[PDB]
Amino acid sequence: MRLCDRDIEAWLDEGRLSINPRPPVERINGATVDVRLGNKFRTFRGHTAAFIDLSGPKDEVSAALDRVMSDEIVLDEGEAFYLHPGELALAVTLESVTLPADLVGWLDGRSSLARLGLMVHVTAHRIDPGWSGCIVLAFYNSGKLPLALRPGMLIGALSFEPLSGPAVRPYNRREDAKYRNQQGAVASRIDKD
Amino acid sequence: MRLCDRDIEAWLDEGRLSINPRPPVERINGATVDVRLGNKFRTFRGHTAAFIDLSGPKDEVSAALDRVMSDEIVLDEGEAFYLHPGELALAVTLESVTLPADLVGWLDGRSSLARLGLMVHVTAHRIDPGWSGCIVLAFYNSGKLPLALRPGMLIGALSFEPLSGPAVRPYNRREDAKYRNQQGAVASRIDKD
Amino acid sequence: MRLCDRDIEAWLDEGRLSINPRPPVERINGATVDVRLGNKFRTFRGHTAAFIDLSGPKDEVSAALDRVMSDEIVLDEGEAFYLHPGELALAVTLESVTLPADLVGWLDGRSSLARLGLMVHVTAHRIDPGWSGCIVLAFYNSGKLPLALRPGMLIGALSFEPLSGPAVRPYNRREDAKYRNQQGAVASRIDKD
Ligand SMILES: O=c1ccn([C@H]2C[C@H](O)[C@@H](COP(=O)(O)OP(=O)(O)OP(=O)(O)O)O2)c(=O)[nH]1
Numbered sequence: 320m321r322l323c324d325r326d327i328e329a330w331l332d333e334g335r336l337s338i339n340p341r342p343p344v345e346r347i348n349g350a351t352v353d354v355r356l357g358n359k360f361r362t363f364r365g366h367t368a369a370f371i372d373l374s375g376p377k378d379e380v381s382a383a384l385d386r387v388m389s390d391e392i393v394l395d396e397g398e399a400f401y402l403h404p405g406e407l408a409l410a411v412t413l414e415s416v417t418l419p420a421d422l423v424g425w426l427d428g429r430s431s432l433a434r435l436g437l438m439v440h441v442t443a444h445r446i447d448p449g450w451s452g453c454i455v456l457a458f459y460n461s462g463k464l465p466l467a468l469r470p471g472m473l474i475g476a477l478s479f480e481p482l483s484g485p486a487v488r489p490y491n492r493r494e495d496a497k498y499r500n501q502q503g504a505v506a507s508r509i510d511k512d
Numbered sequence: 513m514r515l516c517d518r519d520i521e522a523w524l525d526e527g528r529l530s531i532n533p534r535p536p537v538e539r540i541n542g543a544t545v546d547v548r549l550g551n552k553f554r555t556f557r558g559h560t561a562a563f564i565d566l567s568g569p570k571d572e573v574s575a576a577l578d579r580v581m582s583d584e585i586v587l588d589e590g591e592a593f594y595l596h597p598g599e600l601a602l603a604v605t606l607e608s609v610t611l612p613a614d615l616v617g618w619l620d621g622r623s624s625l626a627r628l629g630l631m632v633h634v635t636a637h638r639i640d641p642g643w644s645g646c647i648v649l650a651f652y653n654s655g656k657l658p659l660a661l662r663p664g665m666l667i668g669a670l671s672f673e674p675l676s677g678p679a680v681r682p683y684n685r686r687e688d689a690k691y692r693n694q695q696g697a698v699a700s701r702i703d704k705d
Numbered sequence: 706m707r708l709c710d711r712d713i714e715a716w717l718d719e720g721r722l723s724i725n726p727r728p729p730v731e732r733i734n735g736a737t738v739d740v741r742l743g744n745k746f747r748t749f750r751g752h753t754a755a756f757i758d759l760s761g762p763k764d765e766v767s768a769a770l771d772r773v774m775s776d777e778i779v780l781d782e783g784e785a786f787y788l789h790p791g792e793l794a795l796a797v798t799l800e801s802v803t804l805p806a807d808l809v810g811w812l813d814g815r816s817s818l819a820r821l822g823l824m825v826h827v828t829a830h831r832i833d834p835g836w837s838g839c840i841v842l843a844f845y846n847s848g849k850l851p852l853a854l855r856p857g858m859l860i861g862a863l864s865f866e867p868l869s870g871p872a873v874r875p876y877n878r879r880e881d882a883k884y885r886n887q888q889g890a891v892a893s894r895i896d897k898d
């Protein structure tokens with residue numbers, strides 16, 4: 320049972336859910352709220368490491384991650400990020416979303432973007448109960464043309480599903496949660512596993 | 513709450529939900545209905561453009577789109593569409609689906625197709641309340657062999673989720689909705705944002 | 706509605722669904738249960754075949770699948786599988802999962818993995834009511850570095866959604882179901898279509 324548009328509004332109105340800035344009525348429809356693209360990005364520098372050991376020693380993994388990740392890119396006014404076919408990049412939503420303990424969120428991309436090969440997540444689109452922050456995007460261009468991405472564009476959509484009850488270990492209370500207070504296009508923290 | 517198979521049948525009998533043609537009983541099971549491939553495709557002409565500006569002047573965007581999209585391809589008796597590794601293609605379902613204001617639909621592929629690398633959507637699989645039309649597929653072959661696609665093959669599954677109530681701004685009434693009554697392998701209308 | 710963590714635990718306590726071995730409390734949180742990578746893999750041998758006719762004669766398809774699919778690869782203690790950019794491979798969860806006729810499961814990857822391009826499914830992530838067995842993973846590396854995967858690592862998450870009622874044709878009782886009693890890194894059985 321996803322929340323319909325009307326019930327998304329009522330949750331935002333009660334304060335059970337928060338999205339900041341609040342998208343206007345025109346971006347709240349059916350069962351979704353549209354989200355927008357941020358201005359923070361990150362790319363990869365492959366020439367600095369051979370591989371990433373997903374479950375290796377924490378120090379080695381951490382060092383490899385630091386070598387391979389670019390600095391955070393902040394786009395000048397009227398500047399685009401050019402996402403080329405075959406390229407994975409990180410970005411972020413404009414909006415910060417905060418979920419209560421009794422709700423879960425789901426990121427979709429967009430059919431218009433899908434038909435040009437742009438994936439807005441890499442089999443990870445769950446926004447957990449207790450989540451609070453902007454949402455980091457893993458972009459991949461599976462199409463044949465480079466896509467110019469500009470801050471402010473409509474980039475995806477969120478839906479919302481009540482849980483069977485309130486989560487007992489929501490994300491804000493989980494001591495081994497990686498992504499609380501998530502600022503900008505944060506890189507993988509797989510080394511904290 | 514997804515509609516189970518016997519409730520999918522009930523909703524179809526009752527007529528607010530429509531799938532046309534209606535899959536037989538052997539194709540409605542668990543919490544899904546199987547869907548089949550149509551006969552309309554499009555491909556991409558990359559040599560005609562440097563990039564697509566996904567937030568550019570509506571005129572320039574609309575023109576770049578028109579250069580890069582192939583004419584709609586319609587397949588002869590016994591023809592295959594050969595989907596090569598690394599290529600994005602557009603196709604269409606056989607079936608047309610109609611959802612009322614109080615239902616959302618979700619498109620899956622198939623595990624049998626997944627194990628050969630066939631993706632059937634590009635992070636965009638929500639079928640909205642109020643949707644009426646055949647579903648456009650953005651295919652991507654992530655695998656190691658070309659896959660021959662033939663009209664009428666089983667291509668994916670739809671499941672259906674009641675909303676918390678009837679959407680106030682369903683897809684069929686939304687004046688900025690891009691794809692109402694969609695009737696072939698329709699290219700991106702990202703230029704209408 | 707998804708089951709919250711506390712309810713997931715209840716359903717496990719009561720034998721309502723099964724996950725074997727049972728993940729500990731630190732892996733059940735919010736609306737999910739974390740799952741782990743098994744030790745069986747398959748790759749592809751593209752040189753043995755020109756293509757796969759998904760919808761062709763059953764005979765010929767089966768022969769092609771048998772030529773292209775590798776023998777099952779079984780990794781030792783501590784051993785790694787190197788998943789390189791642009792390569793699909795098959796693998797399997799550590800956990801076996803059994804769902805009743807009134808529940809559907811859903812498979813997510815992990816944000817930490819998404820941010821390095823690891824897809825854990827290829828648009829096929831539904832676990833059906835009536836399912837019983839380990840889950841075959843279709844892995845694709847959309848990123849810029851190779852990724853070492855070790856048996857036992859955290860690979861993804863499961864969420865569980867009650868259906869509108871019991872499925873009348875759950876997976877365990879459906880005649881043309883392909884994947885009952887599976888079986889390690891089982892290849893595509895699309896030839897059974
Ligand atoms: O694989 C898909 C997924 C969705 N749709 C349809 C169903 C849906 O109801 C509609 C809108 O999808 P979305 O909202 O993801 O696309 P958009 O580019 O944002 O279009 P709009 O601007 O109309 O919202 O397009 C498809 O045809 N194929």
Ligand SMILES: O=c1ccn([C@H]2C[C@H](O)[C@@H](COP(=O)(O)OP(=O)(O)OP(=O)(O)O)O2)c(=O)[nH]1
Binds near residue numbers: 625826834840
């Ligand atoms: O990543 C996944 C996703 C699903 N499955 C299992 C669970 C599910 O219940 C079953 C069938 O899924 P699906 O119907 O998508 O596969 P199919 O190719 O259509 O097979 P069938 O003919 O048995 O329906 O396979 C996996 O092993 N791995």
Ligand SMILES: O=c1ccn([C@H]2C[C@H](O)[C@@H](COP(=O)(O)OP(=O)(O)OP(=O)(O)O)O2)c(=O)[nH]1
Binds near residue numbers: 446447448455
């Ligand atoms: O596209 C996404 C998807 C999720 N998240 C956030 C929301 C979510 O609540 C959290 C964790 O998601 P996941 O559990 O998939 O990540 P993990 O790698 O398993 O992190 P953790 O160890 O903190 O659970 O990260 C994003 O920022 N972007």
Ligand SMILES: [Mg+2]
Binds near residue numbers: 429
């Ligand atoms: Mg939309």
Ligand SMILES: [Mg+2]
Binds near residue numbers: 622623
């Ligand atoms: Mg199936």
Ligand SMILES: [Mg+2]
Binds near residue numbers: 815
């Ligand atoms: Mg997690």
